[PDB]
Design a protein around this ligand. Structure first.
Ligand SMILES: CCCCCCCCCCCCCCCCCC(=O)OC[C@H](COP(=O)([O-])OCC(O)COP(=O)([O-])OC[C@@H](COC(=O)CCCCCCCCCCCCCCCCC)OC(=O)CCCCCCCCCCCCCCCCC)OC(=O)CCCCCCCCCCCCCCCCC
Ligand SMILES: CCCCCCCCCCCCCCCCCC(=O)OC[C@H](COP(=O)([O-])OCC(O)COP(=O)([O-])OC[C@@H](COC(=O)CCCCCCCCCCCCCCCCC)OC(=O)CCCCCCCCCCCCCCCCC)OC(=O)CCCCCCCCCCCCCCCCC
Ligand SMILES: CCCCC/C=C/C/C=C/C/C=C\C/C=C\CCCC(=O)O[C@H](COC(=O)CCCCCCCCCCCCCCCCC)COP(=O)(O)O[C@@H]1[C@H](O)[C@H](O)[C@@H](O)[C@H](O)[C@H]1O
Ligand SMILES: COC1=C(OC)C(=O)C(C/C=C(\C)CC/C=C(\C)CC/C=C(\C)CC/C=C(/C)CC/C=C(\C)CC/C=C(\C)CC/C=C(\C)CC/C=C(/C)CCC=C(C)C)=C(C)C1=O
Ligand SMILES: CCCCCCCCCCCCCCCCCC(=O)OC[C@H](COP(=O)(O)OCCN)OC(=O)CCCCCCCCCCCCCCCCC
Ligand SMILES: CCCCCCCCCCCCCCCCCC(=O)OC[C@H](COP(=O)(O)OCCN)OC(=O)CCCCCCCCCCCCCCCCC
Ligand SMILES: CCCCCCCCCCCCCCCCCC(=O)OC[C@H](COP(=O)(O)OCCN)OC(=O)CCCCCCCCCCCCCCCCC
Ligand SMILES: CCCCCCCCCCCCCCCCCC(=O)OC[C@H](COP(=O)(O)OCCN)OC(=O)CCCCCCCCCCCCCCCCC
Ligand SMILES: CCCCCCCCCCCC(=O)OC[C@H](COP(=O)(O)OCC[N+](C)(C)C)OC(=O)CCCCCCCCCCC
Lengths: 76, 183, 127, 57, 340, 86, 167, 171, 89, 68
């Protein structure tokens, strides 16, 4: 028989107890917590070292902000 | 070529017909099976109008979860039912007819804005003009309808997705909390 | 006329035809001891209503709020490029709000059926 | 006395790799895969008869 | 008009044969696993065994017991038959070779596999017995409970493509398959596939329940041939789903250099040769996968319903929540979101 | 060793799906007129295929290339009239 | 390019007597500018929840006799107290950006920090990894969300270009 | 903007543009020639296309009738581009868009005829194919060597012509 | 608007004049919700926006959770009384 | 054994006409040595070959289409 110590009595001993005896819950939570913690702490390291961010794609016809200068050619 | 014209009207008639077999069926689960047929008629109408995405969302969500839930209830539970005898519902028939007329017409009324009441109803029926569809070349990518829903659920109405998460949470917690009998 | 709708019209006519060749070609010849449901070569009385466990009904009541999330994650997966960096965090928060209701469910042991086969815990105190 | 979880020679990672990668299930799978590639026992009855001792009745 | 009716004739007749010989091949390989021959008394090497079963099975009479609704009893084989057979449109046997190419073929493939639950549950009420009804309950609860994680595996895969089209997935897959990054996903999709048909690793109804022959015990003739066809169509259909979104659909290797050796120009022999290679790759994926189903049938005992529900909801699904969190976060950390 | 009788119905399944896919690809190419299918069609691509069917004259994807368009080309332009949707 | 607001915006539109700093401050700036009295409010709410539970048992105990509450409840009282203290903290400090309370201490910091970004040759409010339409939509979501702090916690993490200010 | 559904009926009108509008040559090129010459009609006719869309912006809802005079010139200058590319490299332009006829008109599957066409047009029609919005230290994708995404089948005519252009030394 | 209004009104009157059992009352509620959907989806198609489609995809989920909640309410109603009356609750 | 080479070499040794007759008769392809014939008329064979399991060595080829 294996009893629950509780997370509060000993932290790392509870982590070891969950790893040996409830491996589906411990590893489900480990794969889940590896996501957003890495999304917080690993993306500025990538932008500083691996490659910077891509330029944005266009979505419609790109209008400039000008005032219709005259054009020559193809009158008739 | 013009055999493919009246389809929408056919589905309307077919949908009407299906509801009469829902409210009048001796066995319950036979009438719930007629409701499954009514979802199929709805998905036919939604493909037919131009919304092919929704039709499969109806077949997935309504038919495959809600109806499966309903049939699953009716199996292992006890429900008495009485047949549609003429003697018990012939007393209902006049209020049925009056409510059919009034609720049908008055549902057809608010699509229209003349102050005169009879002009409100006739604008319900003047639809026989054929809308002209023009090709505009302004769009460069295949944003489908589901892409646009995923852009508006996620940026402009992200809070509605998040309050919706609270609702889905409640739909988990509730049935559990009723049917536990803790200890 | 695409070849998509020949198929959805055409599977049924095959099925109706196989059902028809059974109804036409096999004999019918029933009687009373042939009719009647099968349980292991013994008839019995069926009880009018029987009891069930709450986990049996709870599986399929609980099924639908998880199904409705999986179809709510389906608008996002098609627009995942457009909402770069922002709809990502909203979908994270949505999934996390779901996961804490799920850990409520797994902490209550709602779908587990206990066994009343207790090994007589109480020892032998005498006199 | 049966051993607790803490007095075990296997690591948690080593034990749970066998848990999530289904180790002995794959071993028993490979047994019957070995049996796919061997000689069957069937004899063809009206053409080949089985054993006879003279004592048979 | 002549060309679309001959293509649907040939695809029908290629699929309806290949679900018949699946059962022959099953008895064959299950025999050799158990060190015995399969059938060899019906054709030259045992072939057209399934035709012997089918022609006799159409000649048995149909009995409809006294507790039953006779309509429901005969309409659940038809709806289970068509639902197991309607899903054969959307599979591609090559680039854009379907029986209807629609822009959202996964949503269709996922809505038809939702329609297949009914012919279990509805068939429980026809011949209403309290020993039959509860077995139909257990079957339907298992069936939906593993359909959940089936649908979820799909949506995890469509995170990489962001397109509900299917040949778009397979064209996306040319750079790398999706089994080799997502290896645990292959294992849990395989076991959810074994569950969704109620194969006899994960069966309780056909063997263990209070009926000796599953929910369909009281049948004969056409209502048994339709269920029998529908189960093995379900076998090769979920095998097809695995074949396109997780293994390569029609992709084997590059084969540009072999063509630049052999051919000179586009001609009908070149399109024929390319079609043979593509559908050969798809077929060998699908055949290795049906062999895996028959191989896992041989070696194993079955499940209690408690073991089954504790398996799906308590073990596999929290792991799946971790997978939901880890994979868009990995697409997030590196600057790579998939474009429509 | 390996039994041919076990793998013979798998040989049938492999051959039936292979011949099916090959015959289907030949029917698709005969439908297009010697070229391959278009496996994913945008709204832009669908409007463009209609425009091409208007350009070449009758045939599906003849894919003409001319400097200046013909004279029936300015007049054969179509609008689509959709019914009431009641 | 990634700096145009493409909007019309209220300009220096003070919400009280005092001049505004931002229309929504970023989370980093709020955590940077908070006073020592604000960390005192955080500490007050961390101490008030377990002392409040022990008090409210000393008024009327649960089981008829007075005992102390278990450490299981004191741990969660400390956590929810830090949550109340941080919510009150963030709300107090964001009020000084809006110009509704005294911000003469923080306004000099913002003169100095907006003058330091001009000397370092970078954007006045941050380069963000969003298209400008997503920045605008994201900060229409995060605008004035310190009202309604009672219902839901919502914060600003987007570096979007408009904050209700000239230049 | 929305698709026609539920029994749409196509209709045409035999009628003519009025007297005050002058006549204009229309483009007769098809989707693979148009998608081929897209970058070169965008390179030559940037300010005319820009004038058209900028006029259409400035006169809101006027739209059709009031910027007709400029939508004349965009069609005329793109017809000029495609006539010049015909007379310059009809054979290699044809090689390109006949490659694009297969492979779903994907530009990803026809790199080796595209290199020939881009060289021939930059040599003689002296227009260059560029992708704007692309900041430096980002390689343009039709220049890269060993891309991840290769076609299923290289077409035979352009592989042969590409090897012959290697042997000629013009590449 | 004819199909959604007719489904809504006929489902509403079938709900109101239900005296025979209770599961007909649940399924009349769900067919009502389908009718409101149909009216809205048509109005989205005719107006060229996803806006009503946004309200539609939200009310799909809310109809789902309404089914889940209320059918658990029925199991609670059935727990103490081993039969459901024909005339109603 | 169950190999293809065994059935191939026995088909080559027995010959194609007697191969077709043994295939309509049994599923296996067997090469024997004519030990003797029956008074009813039934030829019997015994197998030398190395890859033969136990109880496979001896067999009958009947005379009638209806055999017992
Ligand atoms: C993934 C992405 C991350 C986002 C989500 C975060 C989830 C990560 C949580 C880590 C969980 C790891 C773990 O070990 O769980 C084991 C745990 C096993 O516990 P157990 O002892 O076996 O329970 C059985 C016992 O009978 C029962 O024993 P028990 O009754 O003693 O209970 C044990 C406890 C077990 O749970 C835990 O103890 C884990 C708690 C971790 C979260 C704590 C966060 C605290 C952050 C604020 C810090 C304040 C203190 C600072 C002090 C002053 C500093 C100056 O259960 C709880 O009480 C749940 C905690 C209730 C939530 C209270 C949180 C208050 C809100 C705080 C918000 C603060 C906002 C600050 C503003 C932001 C500023 C930037 O399993 C779980 O808790 C299930 C998961 C749910 C986690 C929540
Ligand atoms: C909130 C308080 C706790 C914050 C956690 C620590 C975050 C941090 O300090 O890093 C700052 C960090 C600053 O970055 P930086 O280097 O200084 O400057 C670059 C710009 O930020 C870059 O800005 P940008 O324009 O360049 O990019 C757009 C923006 C896009 O981001 C956004 O726009 C966020 C949009 C959603 C905002 C959510 C607000 C909170 C909503 C709460 C839920 C509402 C429920 C309402 C129900 C109805 O930024 C990103 O792309 C980063 C997204 C990264 C995704 C990973 C996020 C992981 C979420 C789970 C956190 C797990 C924490 C570890 C375990 C503890 O910003 C972030 O990392 C964003 C983190 C987003 C986390 C939001 C989820 C919080 C949920 C907790 C709510 C409960 C709190 C209770 C408080 C009680 C008071 C009443
Ligand atoms: C061949 C190559 C391809 C294979 C196809 C499938 C194999 C088909 C082989 C089928 C052979 C026929 C076997 C059928 C057979 O014998 O039942 C005999 C028919 O006696 C023929 O008069 C026999 C006339 C049968 C008509 C021929 C139909 C040919 C099969 C078409 C498919 C039964 O007499 P029966 O009147 O009492 O049987 C009747 C009748 O079966 C039911 O419809 C009535 O409801 C019932 O009251 C009952 O009385
Ligand atoms: C452990 O022992 C057992 C087995 O191994 C011996 C089994 O195989 C099985 C399974 C039983 C079978 C595979 C036998 C049933 C096979 C059939 C009914 C074949 C049916 C054939 C068809 C439907 C033909 C379809 C073809 C067409 C329609 C032609 C198209 C034109 C069980 C249940 C079992 O208990
Ligand atoms: C993330 C979401 C994905 C996973 C969602 C499922 C989580 C399940 C949580 C849970 O159920 O905990 C309950 C369990 C209690 O166990 P038990 O006593 O058997 O009670 C069962 C009911 N009677 O509690 C447990 O015993 C198991 C919980 C173990 C928690 C410890 C986890 C520590 C994580 C460390 C991993 C490090 C990964 C690297 C990331 C570094 C970040 C710092
Ligand atoms: C697919 C192809 C369609 C094939 C359908 C053909 C139906 C023919 C079967 C038939 O004649 O009716 C059989 C049906 C049996 O039901 P019954 O005998 O009344 O009750 C037995 C309870 N143990 O008897 C009935 O009560 C009739 C129910 C169906 C109504 C069809 C009437 C058939 C008329 C034959 C002319
Ligand atoms: C109706 C049944 C329920 C609705 C199912 C809808 C399935 C579906 O999505 O059909 C899609 C398909 C066309 O969709 P799409 O993706 O745009 O095709 C692109 C071609 N390159 O559609 C098709 O190709 C053919 C449509 C088949 C269904 C038409 C049936 C009309 C129903 C009339 C009912 C009359 C009573
Ligand atoms: C550091 C990173 C993190 C590392 C971890 C990685 C996480 C991702 C890995 C995910 C892979 C998951 C695969 C599925 C795991 C299933 C777990 C399992 O084995 O079931 C355990 C269950 C017993 O449960 P429990 O109560 O805990 O037992 C304690 C005993 N006192 O026992 C059971 O339920 C019975 C077992 C059922 C298994 C299904 C078997 C059916 C079919 C087998 C498929 C084999 C595939 C072969 C196909 C062809 C191969 C060539
Ligand atoms: C290609 C896939 C089909 C190949 C199977 C051929 C087997 C065979 O044709 O079998 C030959 C059959 C029946 O032979 P039998 O007497 O039962 O065998 C006795 C030999 N034993 C004792 C070893 C078992 O004869 C026939 O007239 C069948 C003619 C119709 C053929 C229908 C084909 C449907 C496809």
């Amino acid at each position: 028989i294996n009893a629950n110590p509780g997370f509060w009595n000993g932290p790392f001993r509870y982590l070891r107890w969950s790893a040996h005896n409830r491996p589906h819950l411990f590893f489900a939570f480990a794969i889940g917590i590896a996501g957003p913690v890495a999304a917080l702490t690993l993306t500025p390291l990538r932008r500083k070292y691996l490659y910077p961010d891509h330029s944005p794609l266009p979505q419609s016809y790109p209008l400039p902000q000008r005032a219709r200068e005259g054009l020559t050619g193809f009158d008739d | 070529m013009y055999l493919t014209y009246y389809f929408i009207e056919i589905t309307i008639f077919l949908a009407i017909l299906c509801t009469i077999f829902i409210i009048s069926a001796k066995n319950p689960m036979v009438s719930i099976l007629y409701m499954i047929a009514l979802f199929v008629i709805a998905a036919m109408y939604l493909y037919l109008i131009g919304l092919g995405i929704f039709s499969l969302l109806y077949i997935m969500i309504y038919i495959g979860a809600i109806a499966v839930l309903f049939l699953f209830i009716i199996t292992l539970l006890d429900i008495n039912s009485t047949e549609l005898s003429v003697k018990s519902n012939i007393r209902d028939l006049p209020l049925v007819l009056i409510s059919l007329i009034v609720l049908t017409i008055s549902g057809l009324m608010i699509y229209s804005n003349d102050s005169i009441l009879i002009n409100k109803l006739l604008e319900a029926f003047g639809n026989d003009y054929n809308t002209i569809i023009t090709q505009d070349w302004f769009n460069i990518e295949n944003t489908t309808l589901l892409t646009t829903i995923g852009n508006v659920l996620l940026t402009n109405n992200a809070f509605i997705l998040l309050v919706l998460a609270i609702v889905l949470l409640l739909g988990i917690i509730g049935p559990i909390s009723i049917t536990m009998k803790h200890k | 006329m695409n070849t998509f709708i020949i198929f959805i019209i055409l599977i049924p006519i095959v099925g109706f035809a196989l059902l028809a060749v059974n109804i036409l070609l096999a004999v019918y010849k029933p009687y009373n001891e042939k009719l009647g449901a099968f349980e292991c070569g013994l008839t019995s009385f069926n009880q009018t209503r029987l009891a069930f466990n709450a986990a049996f009904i709870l599986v399929a009541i609980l099924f639908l709020p998880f199904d409705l999330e999986i179809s709510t994650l389906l608008p996002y997966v098609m627009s995942i490029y457009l909402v770069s960096n922002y709809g990502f965090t909203i979908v994270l928060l949505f999934l996390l709000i779901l996961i804490i209701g799920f850990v409520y469910e797994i902490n209550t042991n709602a779908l587990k059926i206990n066994k009343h086969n207790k090994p007589n815990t109480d020892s032998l105190i005498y006199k | 006395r049966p051993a607790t979880w803490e007095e075990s020679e296997e690591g948690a990672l080593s034990k749970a790799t066998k848990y999530f990668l289904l180790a002995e299930m794959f071993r028993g799978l490979y047994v019957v895969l070995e049996q796919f590639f061997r000689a069957p026992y069937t004899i063809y009855y009206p053409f080949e008869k089985g054993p006879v001792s003279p004592r048979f009745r | 008009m002549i060309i679309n009716i001959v293509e649907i004739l040939i695809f029908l007749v290629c699929v309806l044969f290949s679900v018949a010989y699946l059962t022959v091949a099953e008895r064959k390989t299950l025999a050799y696993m158990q060190r015995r021959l399969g059938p060899n008394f019906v054709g030259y090497y045992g072939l057209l065994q399934a035709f012997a079963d089918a022609v006799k099975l159409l000649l048995k009479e149909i009995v409809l017991p006294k507790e039953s609704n006779y309509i429901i009893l005969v309409i659940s084989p038809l709806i289970t038959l068509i639902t197991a057979l309607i899903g054969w449109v959307v599979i591609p046997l090559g680039p854009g070779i379907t029986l209807g190419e629609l822009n959202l073929g996964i949503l269709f493939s996922l809505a038809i596999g939702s329609l297949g639950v009914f012919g279990s549950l509805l068939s429980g009420w026809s011949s209403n017995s309290k020993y039959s009804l509860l077995g139909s309950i257990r079957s339907t609860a298992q069936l939906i409970s593993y359909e959940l994680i089936l649908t979820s595996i799909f949506i995890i895969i469509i995170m990489f493509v962001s397109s509900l089209n299917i040949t778009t997935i397979i064209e996306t897959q040319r750079v790398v398959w999706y089994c080799i990054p997502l290896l645990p996903l292959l294992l849990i999709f395989f076991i959810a596939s074994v569950a969704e048909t109620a194969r006899p690793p994960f069966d309780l109804t056909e063997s263990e329940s209070e009926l000796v022959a599953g929910y369909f015990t009281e049948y004969s003739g056409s209502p048994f041939v339709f269920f029998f066809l529908a189960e093995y169509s379900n076998i090769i259909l979920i095998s097809a789903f695995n074949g396109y979104l997780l293994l390569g659909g029609y992709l084997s290797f590059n084969y540009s250099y072999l063509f630049n050796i052999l051919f000179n120009d586009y001609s009908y022999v070149s399109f024929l040769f390319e079609g043979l290679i593509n559908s050969s790759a798809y077929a060998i994926k699908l055949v290795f996968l049906m062999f895996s189903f028959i191989w896992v049938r041989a070696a194993f005992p079955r499940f209690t319903y408690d073991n089954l529900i504790n398996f799906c909801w308590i073990i596999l699904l929290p792991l799946l929540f971790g997978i939901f969190l880890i994979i868009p976060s990995t697409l997030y950390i590196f600057d790579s979101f998939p474009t429509l | 060793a390996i039994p041919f009788e076990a793998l013979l119905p798998y040989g049938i399944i492999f051959g039936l799906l292979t011949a099916g896919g090959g015959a289907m690809q030949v029917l698709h190419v005969y439908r297009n007129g010697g070229v391959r299918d278009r496996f994913a069609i945008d709204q832009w691509d669908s409007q463009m295929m209609e425009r091409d069917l208007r350009l070449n004259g009758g045939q599906g994807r003849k894919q003409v290339d001319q400097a200046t368009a013909p004279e029936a080309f300015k007049h054969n332009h179509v609008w689509k009239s959709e019914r009431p949707l009641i | 390019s990634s700096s145009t607001p493409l909007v019309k915006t209220s300009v220096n539109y003070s919400y009280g007597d005092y001049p505004l700093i931002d229309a929504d401050p970023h989370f980093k700036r709020v955590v940077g500018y908070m006073r020592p009295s604000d960390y005192g409010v955080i500490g007050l709410a961390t101490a008030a929840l377990p002392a409040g539970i022990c008090f409210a048992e000393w008024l009327d105990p649960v089981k008829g006799k007075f005992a102390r509450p278990s450490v299981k409840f004191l741990r969660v009282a400390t956590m929810l107290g830090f949550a109340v203290g941080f919510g009150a903290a963030y709300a107090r400090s964001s009020l000084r950006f809006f110009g509704v309370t005294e911000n003469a201490r923080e306004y000099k910091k913002d003169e100095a920090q907006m003058a330091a970004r001009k000397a370092a040759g970078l954007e006045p409010y941050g380069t963000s990894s969003l298209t400008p339409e997503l920045q605008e939509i994201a900060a229409k979501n995060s605008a004035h969300s310190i009202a309604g702090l009672f219902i839901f916690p919502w914060f600003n993490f987007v570096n979007h270009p408009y904050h209700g200010r000239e230049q | 903007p929305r698709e026609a559904a539920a029994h749409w009926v196509p209709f045409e009108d035999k009628a003519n543009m009025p007297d005050n509008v002058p006549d204009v040559v229309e483009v007769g090129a098809t989707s693979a020639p148009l998608l081929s010459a897209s970058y070169f009609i965008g390179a030559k006719c940037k300010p005319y296309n820009d004038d058209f869309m900028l006029c259409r912006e400035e006169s809101q809802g006027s739209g059709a009738i009031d910027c007709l005079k400029e939508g004349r010139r965009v069609t005329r200058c793109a017809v000029s581009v495609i006539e010049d590319i015909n007379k310059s490299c009809l054979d290699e332009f044809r090689l390109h868009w006949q490659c694009l006829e297969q492979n779903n008109h994907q530009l990803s599957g026809c790199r080796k005829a595209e290199a020939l066409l881009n060289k021939c047009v930059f040599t003689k029609l002296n227009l260059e194919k560029k992708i704007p919005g692309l900041r430096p230290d980002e390689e343009p994708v039709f220049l890269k060597k060993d891309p991840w995404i290769k076609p299923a089948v290289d077409d035979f005519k352009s592989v042969r012509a590409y090897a012959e252009a290697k042997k000629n030394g013009t590449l | 608007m004819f199909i959604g209004t007719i489904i809504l009104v006929l489902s509403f009157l079938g709900f109101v004049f239900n005296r025979r059992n209770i599961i007909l009352a649940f399924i009349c509620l769900e067919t009502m919700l389908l009718g409101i959907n149909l009216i809205l989806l048509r109005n989205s198609v005719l107006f060229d926006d996803i806006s009503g489609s946004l309200f539609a995809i939200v009310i799909i989920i809310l109809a789902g959770v309404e089914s889940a909640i209320g059918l658990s309410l029925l199991v609670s109603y059935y727990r103490l009384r081993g039969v459901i009356n024909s005339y109603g609750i | 054994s169950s190999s293809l080479y065994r059935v191939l070499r026995n088909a080559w040794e027995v010959g194609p006409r007697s191969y077709w007759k043994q295939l309509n008769s049994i599923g296996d392809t067997k090469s024997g040595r004519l030990v003797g014939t029956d008074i009813y008329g039934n030829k019997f064979y015994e197998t030398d070959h190395q890859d033969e399991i136990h109880l496979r060595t001896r067999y009958v080829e009947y005379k009638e289409k209806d055999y017992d």
